[PDB]
Amino acid sequence: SDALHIRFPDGAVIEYEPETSALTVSGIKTASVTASGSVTATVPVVMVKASTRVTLDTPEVVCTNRLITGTLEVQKGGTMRGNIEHTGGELSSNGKVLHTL
Amino acid sequence: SGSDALHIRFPDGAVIEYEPETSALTVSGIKTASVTASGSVTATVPVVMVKASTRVTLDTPEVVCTNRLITGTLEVQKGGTMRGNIEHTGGELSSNGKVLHTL
Amino acid sequence: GSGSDALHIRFPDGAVIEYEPETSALTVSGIKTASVTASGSVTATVPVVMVKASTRVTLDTPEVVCTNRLITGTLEVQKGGTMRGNIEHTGGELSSNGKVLHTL
Protein backbone atom coordinates (compact mmCIF):
# COMPACT_ATOMS: atom_id res chain seq x y z
CA SER A 1 0.00 0.00 0.00
CA ASP A 2 3.09 2.25 0.28
CA ALA A 3 4.84 1.35 -3.00
CA LEU A 4 4.38 1.73 -6.75
CA HIS A 5 6.01 -0.54 -9.36
CA ILE A 6 3.70 -1.60 -12.21
CA ARG A 7 5.08 -3.62 -15.15
CA PHE A 8 2.70 -4.08 -18.05
CA PRO A 9 2.68 -6.84 -20.69
CA ASP A 10 3.93 -4.46 -23.40
CA GLY A 11 7.03 -3.57 -21.37
CA ALA A 12 5.69 -0.24 -20.08
CA VAL A 13 6.45 0.65 -16.46
CA ILE A 14 5.06 3.06 -13.90
CA GLU A 15 7.27 3.25 -10.83
CA TYR A 16 8.10 5.45 -7.87
CA GLU A 17 11.54 5.19 -6.24
CA PRO A 18 11.63 6.77 -2.77
CA GLU A 19 15.44 6.54 -2.46
CA THR A 20 15.88 9.26 -5.10
CA SER A 21 12.24 10.45 -4.93
CA ALA A 22 11.86 9.68 -8.64
CA LEU A 23 8.60 9.00 -10.51
CA THR A 24 9.04 7.20 -13.85
CA VAL A 25 6.56 6.38 -16.61
CA SER A 26 8.27 4.61 -19.51
CA GLY A 27 7.66 2.38 -22.48
CA ILE A 28 4.22 3.72 -23.42
CA LYS A 29 3.06 4.91 -26.85
CA THR A 30 0.51 7.57 -25.87
CA ALA A 31 -0.69 9.39 -22.81
CA SER A 32 -3.79 11.58 -22.65
CA VAL A 33 -4.95 13.63 -19.66
CA THR A 34 -8.39 15.28 -19.85
CA ALA A 35 -9.41 17.65 -17.05
CA SER A 36 -12.22 20.17 -16.71
CA GLY A 37 -10.33 22.75 -14.62
CA SER A 38 -6.54 22.96 -14.61
CA VAL A 39 -3.25 21.09 -14.90
CA THR A 40 -0.36 22.54 -12.89
CA ALA A 41 3.32 21.65 -12.55
CA THR A 42 5.51 23.35 -9.93
CA VAL A 43 9.19 22.38 -10.10
CA PRO A 44 12.44 24.31 -10.70
CA VAL A 45 13.31 22.69 -14.04
CA VAL A 46 10.99 21.50 -16.80
CA MET A 47 12.53 19.69 -19.77
CA VAL A 48 10.49 18.70 -22.82
CA LYS A 49 12.52 16.64 -25.31
CA ALA A 50 10.20 16.34 -28.32
CA SER A 51 11.83 15.15 -31.53
CA THR A 52 8.86 16.22 -33.71
CA ARG A 53 7.02 19.22 -32.23
CA VAL A 54 5.47 20.85 -29.18
CA THR A 55 2.05 22.41 -29.93
CA LEU A 56 0.45 24.84 -27.49
CA ASP A 57 -3.07 25.07 -28.92
CA THR A 58 -4.60 27.79 -26.79
CA PRO A 59 -5.89 31.35 -27.18
CA GLU A 60 -2.89 32.63 -25.22
CA VAL A 61 0.54 31.38 -24.19
CA VAL A 62 2.06 33.60 -21.49
CA CYS A 63 5.79 33.57 -20.68
CA THR A 64 6.19 35.67 -17.55
CA ASN A 65 9.83 36.72 -18.10
CA ARG A 66 12.30 35.80 -20.87
CA LEU A 67 11.52 33.82 -24.01
CA ILE A 68 14.55 32.60 -25.98
CA THR A 69 14.34 30.94 -29.39
CA GLY A 70 16.61 30.03 -32.28
CA THR A 71 14.31 31.22 -35.04
CA LEU A 72 10.97 33.00 -34.89
CA GLU A 73 7.98 32.97 -37.24
CA VAL A 74 5.19 35.47 -36.45
CA GLN A 75 2.36 34.50 -38.78
CA LYS A 76 -0.24 37.25 -38.50
CA GLY A 77 0.90 40.31 -36.51
CA GLY A 78 2.21 41.59 -33.24
CA THR A 79 3.23 44.32 -30.88
CA MET A 80 6.51 45.10 -29.19
CA ARG A 81 7.10 47.48 -26.30
CA GLY A 82 10.42 48.48 -24.76
CA ASN A 83 13.84 48.64 -26.35
CA ILE A 84 14.39 46.14 -29.18
CA GLU A 85 17.98 45.70 -30.42
CA HIS A 86 18.54 43.97 -33.75
CA THR A 87 22.12 43.04 -34.72
CA GLY A 88 24.08 40.37 -36.54
CA GLY A 89 22.20 40.49 -39.82
CA GLU A 90 19.70 42.62 -41.69
CA LEU A 91 16.20 43.68 -40.68
CA SER A 92 14.09 44.07 -43.82
CA SER A 93 10.55 45.39 -44.11
CA ASN A 94 8.58 45.17 -47.35
CA GLY A 95 11.77 44.25 -49.18
CA LYS A 96 13.81 47.19 -47.83
CA VAL A 97 16.82 46.62 -45.57
CA LEU A 98 16.43 49.15 -42.76
CA HIS A 99 20.16 49.37 -41.90
CA THR A 100 22.62 47.66 -44.25
CA LEU A 101 25.21 45.38 -42.68
CA SER B 1 7.64 -8.16 -19.37
CA GLY B 2 5.17 -7.99 -16.51
CA SER B 3 1.52 -8.93 -16.19
CA ASP B 4 0.22 -6.01 -14.12
CA ALA B 5 -2.93 -4.11 -15.03
CA LEU B 6 -4.20 -0.60 -14.32
CA HIS B 7 -7.85 0.32 -14.53
CA ILE B 8 -9.09 2.49 -11.68
CA ARG B 9 -12.71 3.67 -11.85
CA PHE B 10 -13.30 6.35 -9.24
CA PRO B 11 -16.69 7.20 -7.72
CA ASP B 12 -16.74 10.67 -9.29
CA GLY B 13 -16.58 9.08 -12.76
CA ALA B 14 -12.86 9.62 -13.30
CA VAL B 15 -10.79 6.80 -14.80
CA ILE B 16 -7.06 6.08 -14.83
CA GLU B 17 -6.24 3.22 -17.16
CA TYR B 18 -3.48 1.62 -19.19
CA GLU B 19 -4.26 -0.47 -22.27
CA PRO B 20 -1.18 -2.53 -23.24
CA GLU B 21 -2.37 -3.68 -26.67
CA THR B 22 -2.34 -0.07 -27.95
CA SER B 23 0.11 1.09 -25.23
CA ALA B 24 -2.25 3.92 -24.26
CA LEU B 25 -2.30 5.60 -20.83
CA THR B 26 -5.50 7.57 -20.18
CA VAL B 27 -6.56 9.88 -17.36
CA SER B 28 -10.13 11.11 -17.80
CA GLY B 29 -12.97 12.73 -15.92
CA ILE B 30 -10.90 14.77 -13.48
CA LYS B 31 -11.16 18.44 -12.51
CA THR B 32 -7.54 19.21 -11.62
CA ALA B 33 -4.12 17.62 -11.73
CA SER B 34 -0.92 18.87 -10.15
CA VAL B 35 2.66 17.73 -9.82
CA THR B 36 4.96 19.38 -7.27
CA ALA B 37 8.63 18.38 -7.42
CA SER B 38 11.82 19.82 -5.97
CA GLY B 39 14.16 18.96 -8.89
CA SER B 40 12.84 18.41 -12.41
CA VAL B 41 9.96 17.20 -14.56
CA THR B 42 10.91 15.73 -17.95
CA ALA B 43 8.83 14.51 -20.89
CA THR B 44 10.54 12.68 -23.77
CA VAL B 45 8.12 11.94 -26.63
CA PRO B 46 8.06 13.01 -30.30
CA VAL B 47 4.79 14.98 -30.10
CA VAL B 48 3.50 17.07 -27.20
CA MET B 49 -0.02 18.43 -27.72
CA VAL B 50 -1.58 20.86 -25.25
CA LYS B 51 -5.20 21.85 -25.95
CA ALA B 52 -6.00 24.56 -23.43
CA SER B 53 -9.20 26.45 -24.16
CA THR B 54 -8.29 29.32 -21.77
CA ARG B 55 -4.52 29.67 -21.38
CA VAL B 56 -1.07 28.14 -21.05
CA THR B 57 1.17 30.03 -18.59
CA LEU B 58 4.91 29.39 -18.32
CA ASP B 59 5.79 31.23 -15.12
CA THR B 60 9.56 30.95 -15.20
CA PRO B 61 12.65 33.15 -15.55
CA GLU B 62 13.31 31.64 -18.96
CA VAL B 63 11.48 29.65 -21.60
CA VAL B 64 14.03 28.23 -24.07
CA CYS B 65 12.97 26.95 -27.49
CA THR B 66 16.04 25.22 -28.91
CA ASN B 67 15.13 25.66 -32.61
CA ARG B 68 12.04 27.26 -34.18
CA LEU B 69 9.14 29.06 -32.52
CA ILE B 70 5.97 29.78 -34.53
CA THR B 71 3.09 31.91 -33.27
CA GLY B 72 -0.02 33.52 -34.70
CA THR B 73 0.50 36.82 -32.94
CA LEU B 74 3.26 38.05 -30.65
CA GLU B 75 3.25 40.57 -27.80
CA VAL B 76 6.62 41.55 -26.27
CA GLN B 77 6.10 43.63 -23.13
CA LYS B 78 9.55 44.79 -21.97
CA GLY B 79 11.94 44.63 -24.92
CA GLY B 80 14.46 42.20 -26.25
CA THR B 81 17.07 41.35 -28.81
CA MET B 82 16.99 39.86 -32.29
CA ARG B 83 19.99 38.47 -34.14
CA GLY B 84 20.36 37.33 -37.71
CA ASN B 85 18.24 38.21 -40.69
CA ILE B 86 14.70 39.27 -39.77
CA GLU B 87 12.33 39.49 -42.76
CA HIS B 88 9.13 41.47 -42.25
CA THR B 89 6.48 41.48 -45.00
CA GLY B 90 2.74 41.73 -45.49
CA GLY B 91 2.02 44.79 -43.41
CA GLU B 92 3.53 47.75 -41.66
CA LEU B 93 6.47 47.57 -39.25
CA SER B 94 5.96 50.74 -37.21
CA SER B 95 8.17 52.23 -34.54
CA ASN B 96 7.18 55.20 -32.43
CA GLY B 97 4.37 56.09 -34.79
CA LYS B 98 6.09 55.82 -38.17
CA VAL B 99 5.90 53.03 -40.73
CA LEU B 100 9.52 52.07 -41.26
CA HIS B 101 9.46 50.95 -44.90
CA THR B 102 8.22 54.43 -45.92
CA LEU B 103 10.32 56.52 -43.53
CA GLY C 1 -15.55 -0.33 -2.33
CA SER C 2 -13.55 -3.50 -2.73
CA GLY C 3 -12.62 -2.99 -6.38
CA SER C 4 -10.07 -0.74 -8.04
CA ASP C 5 -11.76 2.54 -7.20
CA ALA C 6 -9.21 4.52 -5.19
CA LEU C 7 -5.64 5.81 -5.30
CA HIS C 8 -3.76 7.07 -2.27
CA ILE C 9 -0.09 6.20 -1.78
CA ARG C 10 2.16 7.81 0.84
CA PHE C 11 5.78 6.80 0.34
CA PRO C 12 8.50 6.65 3.00
CA ASP C 13 10.18 9.80 1.62
CA GLY C 14 6.98 11.80 2.25
CA ALA C 15 5.83 11.79 -1.35
CA VAL C 16 2.13 11.36 -2.10
CA ILE C 17 0.43 10.10 -5.23
CA GLU C 18 -3.33 10.28 -4.88
CA TYR C 19 -6.65 10.91 -6.52
CA GLU C 20 -9.21 12.73 -4.38
CA PRO C 21 -12.69 12.09 -5.82
CA GLU C 22 -14.34 14.62 -3.49
CA THR C 23 -12.70 17.45 -5.48
CA SER C 24 -11.72 15.36 -8.54
CA ALA C 25 -8.06 16.24 -7.93
CA LEU C 26 -5.08 14.14 -9.07
CA THR C 27 -2.01 15.06 -7.01
CA VAL C 28 1.66 14.13 -7.02
CA SER C 29 3.68 15.94 -4.37
CA GLY C 30 6.83 15.67 -2.32
CA ILE C 31 8.92 14.17 -5.12
CA LYS C 32 12.31 15.22 -6.53
CA THR C 33 12.00 14.16 -10.18
CA ALA C 34 9.37 12.90 -12.58
CA SER C 35 9.78 11.67 -16.12
CA VAL C 36 7.46 10.40 -18.81
CA THR C 37 8.87 8.64 -21.86
CA ALA C 38 6.48 7.78 -24.69
CA SER C 39 7.07 6.74 -28.30
CA GLY C 40 4.07 8.50 -29.87
CA SER C 41 2.49 11.49 -28.16
CA VAL C 42 1.33 13.09 -24.94
CA THR C 43 -1.88 15.15 -24.99
CA ALA C 44 -3.29 17.34 -22.22
CA THR C 45 -6.79 18.78 -22.76
CA VAL C 46 -7.87 21.20 -20.03
CA PRO C 47 -8.90 24.90 -19.90
CA VAL C 48 -5.93 26.14 -17.88
CA VAL C 49 -2.33 24.94 -17.87
CA MET C 50 0.09 26.50 -15.37
CA VAL C 51 3.80 25.67 -15.23
CA LYS C 52 5.60 27.39 -12.34
CA ALA C 53 9.31 26.67 -12.91
CA SER C 54 11.60 28.76 -10.74
CA THR C 55 14.66 27.97 -12.92
CA ARG C 56 13.64 27.23 -16.52
CA VAL C 57 11.30 25.60 -19.01
CA THR C 58 13.22 24.08 -21.95
CA LEU C 59 11.35 23.02 -25.08
CA ASP C 60 14.03 21.00 -26.89
CA THR C 61 12.22 20.38 -30.15
CA PRO C 62 12.47 21.30 -33.83
CA GLU C 63 9.37 23.46 -33.49
CA VAL C 64 7.23 25.03 -30.80
CA VAL C 65 3.86 26.13 -32.24
CA CYS C 66 1.57 28.56 -30.42
CA THR C 67 -1.69 28.50 -32.35
CA ASN C 68 -2.90 32.00 -31.44
CA ARG C 69 -1.33 34.67 -29.19
CA LEU C 70 2.05 34.48 -27.46
CA ILE C 71 2.87 37.07 -24.78
CA THR C 72 6.32 37.40 -23.23
CA GLY C 73 8.15 39.79 -20.94
CA THR C 74 11.31 39.87 -23.02
CA LEU C 75 12.29 38.17 -26.27
CA GLU C 76 15.66 36.85 -27.48
CA VAL C 77 15.81 35.61 -31.10
CA GLN C 78 19.20 34.00 -31.64
CA LYS C 79 19.36 33.05 -35.32
CA GLY C 80 16.78 35.00 -37.34
CA GLY C 81 13.19 34.84 -38.39
CA THR C 82 10.20 36.19 -40.23
CA MET C 83 7.24 38.37 -39.33
CA ARG C 84 4.07 38.80 -41.37
CA GLY C 85 1.34 41.38 -40.94
CA ASN C 86 1.50 44.54 -38.88
CA ILE C 87 4.19 44.72 -36.20
CA GLU C 88 3.75 47.79 -33.96
CA HIS C 89 6.66 48.93 -31.80
CA THR C 90 6.30 51.64 -29.14
CA GLY C 91 7.60 52.52 -25.70
CA GLY C 92 11.33 52.51 -26.36
CA GLU C 93 13.70 52.39 -29.31
CA LEU C 94 13.97 49.83 -32.11
CA SER C 95 17.59 49.71 -33.29
CA SER C 96 19.19 47.77 -36.12
CA ASN C 97 22.96 47.37 -36.43
CA GLY C 98 23.49 50.18 -33.96
CA LYS C 99 21.05 52.74 -35.42
CA VAL C 100 17.78 53.80 -33.77
CA LEU C 101 15.26 53.52 -36.58
CA HIS C 102 12.79 56.19 -35.42
CA THR C 103 13.00 58.46 -32.38
CA LEU C 104 9.65 59.35 -30.81
Swiss-Prot record, chain B:
It comes from the Viruses. Disulfide bonds: none annotated. Induction: Expressed in the late phase of the viral replicative cycle. It is found in: Virion. Fe cation binds at residue 103. homotrimer. Belongs to the P2likevirus spike protein family. Forms the small spikes on the baseplate that plug the end of the tube before DNA ejection and form a channel perforating the host membrane during ejection. Involved in baseplate assembly. This is Spike protein. It comes from Escherichia phage P2 (Bacteriophage P2).
